[PDB]
Structures are given as C-alpha cells and as structure tokens.
C-alpha cells in the first residue's frame, strides 16, 4: 500500500523467529530504536502492528 493509506497489520498469537529476518542480506535499510535487533528472540511481545 501507499504512504497515505498505510496498512496496520496485527501480528499476535505467533512464535516469532527474527533470526532468519536478520540473517537476510537483501535489505536496503535495517535499524531498530527502542530495542536491540538481536534481542527480539528472547523478549515476549503482543499487539505487534506492521
């Protein structure tokens, strides 16, 4: 979707494996602000909005 009509997608009740997401080498941009990118595999979240 475009910028003005940005979609909000609920990610919940799921087992998250961010290791494979981080191991990808075809990302133009990659940065995290409020949490370390490699620490997402230990913490537990909910209501993850994409």
């Amino acid at each position: 979707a475009s910028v003005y009509a940005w979609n909000r997608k609920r990610i919940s009740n799921c087992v998250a494996d961010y290791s494979v997401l981080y191991n990808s080498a075809s990302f133009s941009t990659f940065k995290c602000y409020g949490v370390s990118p490699t620490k997402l595999n230990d913490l537990c979240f909910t209501n993850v909005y994409a």
């Binding site: 370390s36 620490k39 913490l43």
Partner: protein, 49 residues
C-alpha cells in the same frame, strides 16, 4: 501522644527508608526504571547510556 519524640524518630527513619526504596521506581529520564529490562532489550552502546 505523650511519647511523641521516640515515635517521630521511628517515623522519620521509616519515611527515609521508604523514600529510598521508592526512588528505585523512577527512571530518571531513562527508557525504563528496571535495569533488567534495558539489559534484555538494548545493545550495550546505548544500554550504557
């Protein structure tokens, strides 16, 4: 209330200790007031900050 002086000493010490314990719940401008949260959340560069 005839024994007010001793009770005031006890109460002053109790309030001081309670305030000292309560100060651990303040983040002092950090993202969290809990060290463990920052340890398990952040990258040591800014975790140090």
């Amino acid at each position: 209330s005839a024994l007010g002086k001793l009770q005031d000493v006890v109460n002053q010490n109790a309030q001081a200790l309670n305030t000292l314990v309560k100060q651990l719940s303040s983040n002092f401008g950090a993202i969290s007031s809990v060290l463990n949260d920052i340890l398990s959340r952040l990258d040591p560069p800014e975790a140090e900050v």
